[PDB]
Design an enzyme around this catalytic site. Structure first.
Site, PDB file in Angstrom:
ATOM      1  CG  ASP A 259     -12.939  -9.123  -5.017  1.00 32.38           C
ATOM      2  OD1 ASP A 259     -12.262  -9.742  -5.840  1.00 32.38           O
ATOM      3  OD2 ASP A 259     -12.819  -7.921  -4.922  1.00 32.38           O
TER       4      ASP A 259
ATOM      5  N   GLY B 133      -4.335   1.156   1.784  1.00 35.54           N
ATOM      6  CA  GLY B 133      -4.012   1.802   3.043  1.00 35.54           C
ATOM      7  C   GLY B 133      -2.596   1.446   3.382  1.00 35.54           C
TER       8      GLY B 133
ATOM      9  N   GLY C  10       0.845  -1.200   0.000  1.00 36.86           N
ATOM     10  CA  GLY C  10       0.000   0.000   0.000  1.00 36.86           C
ATOM     11  C   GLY C  10       0.874   1.241   0.000  1.00 36.86           C
TER      12      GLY C  10
END
Ligand SMILES: CNc1nccc(-c2cccnc2Oc2c(C)cc(Nc3nc4ccccc4[nH]3)c3ccccc23)n1
EC number: 2.7.11.24
Length: 328
Positions: A142, A29, A28
């Site tokens: 997902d 948040g 990477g």
């Protein structure tokens, strides 16, 4: 102050003083590894900046904070702490999420050669955490390796809760997601299969710029599907899908040749045929003929481990998130 601030790249981390020696980690948040003085172990801490800032970041943060609270299983993330250094709602900017520091994510484990005991055991734990979500009414939809982490002892956890009912990596989404279909629990078996196949092939199975591209990588490895499948499509996707350039598609031996497997001993030869059986049952376009979680858990590759064991405004999102944080 109860808190202290520290520069970590461009963002400032401002955290409980119990958190020391912040080091930036992962993709990477912003997440930092840190030492927890109070618990005397290492933790990872993610900074959410102004999560309430648009309906997308807000729905998902809210949702995931409410869902974490609920859930409780060793293959699924648990927060050790949630805090904000701001003292009032009017001041509220940032949420920090603290969890146990793990060793690696699954993107990195994928690049490695793994023996069958470790590969089946990772897959077994992924299936335990999926059973567990589905038990709590959560169908992830997902799952992807960046949100799954591992320890050196091969212990695994899934770190997110997936889509709600409403560059992002789309390579692991089921045809039912790719195509708008309607779905059930075995939607997430398809993501386990993409992951399993990439641990074997070490390359993304169904890549592409968009879903168009992704669909084409799918039907041309696996073949155009058929009849009962199509009529669960809406006439217009059915139409694009029915008029797609056709593939016979490859058998699983051609898709996943032996050279990819440990195959030196009789144990390994067998394990490799079992692994291919599972792949063949997980990577199945029509979810009607795709194996369920329960039956995957009973598969001979897997079962050696078996063990019984609304729309809001910004202002509205902020109060909701703030309240989950404070618990009030
Ligand atoms: C190398 N070891 C290691 N150990 C633990 C974590 C990580 C790691 C590294 C880089 C990026 N993220 C990481 O972890 C996380 C992920 C992938 C997902 C999460 N899910 C999540 N759930 C949210 C709910 C609301 C908002 C954001 C959220 N983010 C995490 C939540 C908390 C803390 C870490 C998470 N790395």
């Amino acid at each position: 102050n109860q808190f202290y601030s520290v520069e970590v790249g461009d963002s400032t981390f401002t955290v409980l003083k119990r958190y020391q020696n912040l080091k930036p980690i992962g993709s990477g948040g912003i997440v930092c590894a840190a030492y927890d003085a109070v618990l005397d172990r290492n933790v990872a801490i993610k900074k959410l900046s102004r999560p309430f800032q648009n309906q997308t970041h807000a729905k998902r943060a809210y949702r995931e904070l409410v869902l974490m609270k609920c859930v409780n299983h060793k293959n699924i993330i648990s927060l050790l702490n949630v805090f904000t250094p701001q003292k009032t709602l009017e001041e509220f900017q940032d949420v920090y999420l603290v969890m146990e520091l793990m060793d690696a994510n699954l993107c990195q484990v994928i690049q490695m050669e793994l023996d069958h005991e470790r590969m089946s055991y990772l897959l077994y734990q992924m299936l335990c955490g999926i059973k567990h979500l589905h038990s709590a009414g959560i169908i992830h939809r997902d799952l992807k390796p960046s949100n799954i982490v591992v320890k050196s002892d091969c212990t695994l956890k899934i770190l997110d809760f997936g889509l709600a009912r409403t560059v992002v990596t789309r390579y692991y989404r089921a045809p039912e997601v790719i195509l708008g279909m309607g779905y059930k629990e075995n939607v997430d078996i398809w993501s386990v299969g993409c992951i399993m196949g990439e641990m074997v092939r070490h390359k993304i199975l169904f890549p592409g710029r968009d879903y168009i591209d992704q669909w084409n990588k799918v039907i041309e490895q696996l073949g155009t599907p058929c009849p009962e499948f199509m009529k669960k499509l809406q006439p217009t996707v059915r139409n694009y899908v029915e008029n797609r350039p056709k593939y016979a598609g490859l058998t699983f031996p051609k898709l996943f040749p032996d050279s990819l497997f440990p195959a030196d001993s009789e144990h390994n030869k067998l394990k490799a045929s079992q692994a291919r059986d599972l792949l063949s049952k997980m990577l199945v376009i029509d979810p009607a003929k795709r194996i369920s979680v329960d039956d995957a858990l009973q598969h001979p590759y897997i079962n050696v481990w078996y063990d019984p064991a609304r729309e809001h405004t910004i202002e509205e999102w902020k109060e909701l998130i703030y309240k989950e944080v404070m618990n009030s």
